[PDB]
Design a protein around this motif. Sequence first.
Motif, PDB file in Angstrom:
ATOM      1  N   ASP A  36      -8.440 -25.397 -11.445  1.00  0.00           N
ATOM      2  CA  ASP A  36      -8.899 -24.039 -11.760  1.00  0.00           C
ATOM      3  C   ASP A  36      -9.383 -23.281 -10.523  1.00  0.00           C
ATOM      4  OD1 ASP A  36      -8.294 -24.753 -14.352  1.00  0.00           O
ATOM      5  OD2 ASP A  36     -10.374 -25.176 -14.905  1.00  0.00           O
ATOM      6  N   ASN A  38      -7.636 -20.788  -7.111  1.00  0.00           N
ATOM      7  CA  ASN A  38      -6.538 -20.225  -6.336  1.00  0.00           C
ATOM      8  C   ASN A  38      -6.446 -20.863  -4.951  1.00  0.00           C
ATOM      9  OD1 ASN A  38      -8.878 -19.129  -5.287  1.00  0.00           O
ATOM     10  ND2 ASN A  38      -8.092 -17.037  -5.149  1.00  0.00           N
ATOM     11  N   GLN A  66       1.259 -23.828  -7.108  1.00  0.00           N
ATOM     12  CA  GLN A  66       0.244 -23.223  -7.966  1.00  0.00           C
ATOM     13  C   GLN A  66       0.566 -23.449  -9.437  1.00  0.00           C
ATOM     14  OE1 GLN A  66      -2.535 -22.062  -7.066  1.00  0.00           O
ATOM     15  NE2 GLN A  66      -3.324 -20.600  -8.566  1.00  0.00           N
ATOM     16  N   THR A  67      -0.449 -23.846 -10.207  1.00  0.00           N
ATOM     17  CA  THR A  67      -0.348 -24.058 -11.644  1.00  0.00           C
ATOM     18  C   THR A  67      -1.530 -23.374 -12.319  1.00  0.00           C
ATOM     19  OG1 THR A  67      -1.613 -26.124 -11.788  1.00  0.00           O
ATOM     20  CG2 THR A  67       0.715 -26.297 -11.213  1.00  0.00           C
ATOM     21  N   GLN A  68      -1.433 -23.218 -13.642  1.00  0.00           N
ATOM     22  CA  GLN A  68      -2.521 -22.600 -14.395  1.00  0.00           C
ATOM     23  C   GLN A  68      -3.788 -23.451 -14.397  1.00  0.00           C
ATOM     24  OE1 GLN A  68      -1.206 -20.947 -18.096  1.00  0.00           O
ATOM     25  NE2 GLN A  68      -3.290 -20.583 -18.846  1.00  0.00           N
ATOM     26  N   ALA A  90      -0.655 -27.263 -18.880  1.00  0.00           N
ATOM     27  CA  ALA A  90       0.006 -25.973 -19.069  1.00  0.00           C
ATOM     28  C   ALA A  90       1.525 -26.062 -19.013  1.00  0.00           C
ATOM     29  CB  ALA A  90      -0.494 -24.946 -18.048  1.00  0.00           C
TER      30      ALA A  90
ATOM     31  N   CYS E   5      -9.902 -18.699 -16.745  1.00  0.00           N
ATOM     32  CA  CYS E   5      -8.918 -17.724 -16.287  1.00  0.00           C
ATOM     33  C   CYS E   5      -7.672 -17.755 -17.157  1.00  0.00           C
ATOM     34  CB  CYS E   5      -8.595 -17.907 -14.804  1.00  0.00           C
ATOM     35  SG  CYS E   5      -8.087 -19.500 -14.146  1.00  0.00           S
ATOM     36  N   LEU E   8      -3.720 -14.400 -12.787  1.00  0.00           N
ATOM     37  CA  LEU E   8      -4.651 -15.479 -13.088  1.00  0.00           C
ATOM     38  C   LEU E   8      -5.935 -15.371 -12.279  1.00  0.00           C
ATOM     39  CD1 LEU E   8      -2.211 -18.551 -13.132  1.00  0.00           C
ATOM     40  CD2 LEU E   8      -3.272 -17.488 -15.106  1.00  0.00           C
ATOM     41  N   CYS E  10      -9.451 -16.246 -11.711  1.00  0.00           N
ATOM     42  CA  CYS E  10     -10.326 -17.316 -12.171  1.00  0.00           C
ATOM     43  C   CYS E  10     -11.759 -16.990 -11.778  1.00  0.00           C
ATOM     44  CB  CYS E  10      -9.875 -18.674 -11.625  1.00  0.00           C
ATOM     45  SG  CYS E  10      -8.169 -19.228 -12.118  1.00  0.00           S
ATOM     46  N   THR E  25       2.257 -25.405 -24.615  1.00  0.00           N
ATOM     47  CA  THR E  25       2.060 -23.972 -24.750  1.00  0.00           C
ATOM     48  C   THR E  25       2.655 -23.476 -26.065  1.00  0.00           C
ATOM     49  OG1 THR E  25       4.060 -23.604 -23.452  1.00  0.00           O
ATOM     50  CG2 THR E  25       1.954 -23.574 -22.289  1.00  0.00           C
TER      51      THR E  25
END
Lengths: 99, 49, 50, 150, 40, 50
Positions: A36, A38, A66-68, A90, E5, E8, E10, E25
């Motif tokens: 979580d 960036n 990058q992933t959620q 995700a 988030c 995105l 966060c 999902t």
Amino acid sequence: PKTSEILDISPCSFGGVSVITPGTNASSEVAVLYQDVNCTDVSTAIHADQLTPAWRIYSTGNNVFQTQAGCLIGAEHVDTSYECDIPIGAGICASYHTV
Amino acid sequence: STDLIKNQCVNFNFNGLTGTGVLTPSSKRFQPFQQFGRDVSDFTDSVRD
Amino acid sequence: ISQIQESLTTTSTALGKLQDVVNQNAQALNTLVKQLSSNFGAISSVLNDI
Amino acid sequence: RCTTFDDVQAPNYTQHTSSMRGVYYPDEIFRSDTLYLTQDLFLPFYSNVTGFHTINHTFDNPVIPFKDGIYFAATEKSNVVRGWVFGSTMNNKSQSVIIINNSTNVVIRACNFELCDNPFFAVSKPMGTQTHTMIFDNAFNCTFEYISDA
Amino acid sequence: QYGECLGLICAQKFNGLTVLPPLLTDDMIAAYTAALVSGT
Amino acid sequence: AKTSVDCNMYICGDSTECANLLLQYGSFCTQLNRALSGIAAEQDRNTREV
Ligand SMILES: *[C@@H]1O[C@H](CO[C@@H]2O[C@@H](C)[C@@H](O)[C@@H](O)[C@@H]2O)[C@@H](O[C@@H]2O[C@H](CO)[C@@H](O)[C@H](O)[C@H]2NC(C)=O)[C@H](O)[C@H]1NC(C)=O
Ligand SMILES: *[C@@H]1O[C@H](CO)[C@@H](O[C@@H]2O[C@H](CO)[C@@H](O)[C@H](O)[C@H]2NC(C)=O)[C@H](O)[C@H]1NC(C)=O
Ligand SMILES: *[C@@H]1O[C@H](CO)[C@@H](O[C@@H]2O[C@H](CO)[C@@H](O)[C@H](O)[C@H]2NC(C)=O)[C@H](O)[C@H]1NC(C)=O
Ligand SMILES: *[C@@H]1O[C@H](CO)[C@@H](O)[C@H](O)[C@H]1NC(C)=O
Ligand SMILES: *[C@@H]1O[C@H](CO)[C@@H](O)[C@H](O)[C@H]1NC(C)=O
């Protein structure tokens, strides 16, 4: 006080780190998941030793993704689908496989 | 001091350490610079007479 | 019956449920033991010492 | 009177990986068949080390900072290195200690030493006998001394 | 309230609470349901 | 929900003086994280089973 500007406050980034490995007998490869966040903040904090914990030896290579759920360091993205070995989140899945 | 009383439930005061137990001979091999042995949970397990 | 026998002869993962039961119970006891070494703010962890 | 070796070359410091060496017993207490986890001062694995070498004219005696603790290792064929000297100022101003493997008897002392700029033991080639020990001109305010067995 | 988030951007709040996302999902779940109704 | 918690920000937050006191209790919240992570994995298994 000096200019009567109005300023927000917010915390410095924090979270969990977890380690993805295949079997130790098979190899000593690892991938690191920072949850979580960036990647810009962790890359700009790995450089100039701003992060902690601080390994003595490591490197962020060109492999950043990058992933959620956060971003992985040391894993190479692939444009193909397979059955899951280790679920990440995700929809992102990992495995240990030939190049 | 006293003599030893092996194989019986007795109070023991070897060297500032106190408790109750059953003393028996052992097959430990201490190094010349080690006088005590310990188990997990920090319990004393053996001693040099 | 032959193929199931060879599978059991070579597989390791098939009994992961029972293995998880054994590991859960053993880990729990290990933790309860390790808690004895904590200090809880006492001058020492050793009772007979105090 | 101190003797100064003229024409000595400057050293060429060399880097080597220390690999895994330097582990030592953390505590006296006996333990067995167990894995133990502890924090203390240790030499981290694959850290780099500054190599030194005496060959022919070359002779290196450079003051090295201590950084509150050092590893040390020597490879010697015939007792080339006889010991060390620990101090802070080494100029009539701070207590210093000498540890040397003197052939007759090991000597450890902790007194003001005023150690010679180039301390050394003198030897003769064909006899194989020691002749001088130019380590310290004098010693005052001496508060500690020890002698090992013969 | 807690850090999360959705996308995105966060954000994180001083209380340290967080919410993780599900693996499957919602469009993958809806593809399972449409596959079941289709086959049946 | 599959929620997660961080021990040090909640109990001790920014300060270091409090963390040196929480150290006297040992492993406790770490087995707590171990538990709450088990609940999180279980939710995923439930959906994949259904
Ligand atoms: C090695 O040292 C021995 C002993 O150390 C001596 O005595 C210390 C108190 C200190 O003064 C050191 O600097 C000395 O070197 C030397 O042997 C001694 O020799 C003296 C006579 O010169 C004699 O009175 C002592 O009894 C000796 N000590 C013994 C035998 O233990 C020795 O000369 C030194 N050098 C060599 C090469 O052996
Ligand atoms: C004991 O150690 C202290 C600090 O490690 C030494 O003090 C230093 O002395 C030098 C001398 O030039 C100063 O430049 C430093 O600023 C001092 N402090 C530090 C942190 O280095 C002291 O010299 C040592 N004792 C003796 C007898 O030398
Ligand atoms: C340690 O102290 C002695 C004595 O104070 C120093 O010897 C002096 O040396 C200077 C020049 O080298 C002479 O002019 C003095 O006459 C000497 N003093 C005596 C009493 O003879 C010695 O130099 C000091 N150590 C160092 C390394 O300087
Ligand atoms: C090891 O090399 C690093 C540079 O990578 C240097 O900073 C350090 O001083 C070296 N260690 C020594 C010389 O003991
Ligand atoms: C020994 O030290 C004292 C003070 O500690 C000093 O007065 C004396 O001069 C010293 N001895 C010498 C220099 O011989």
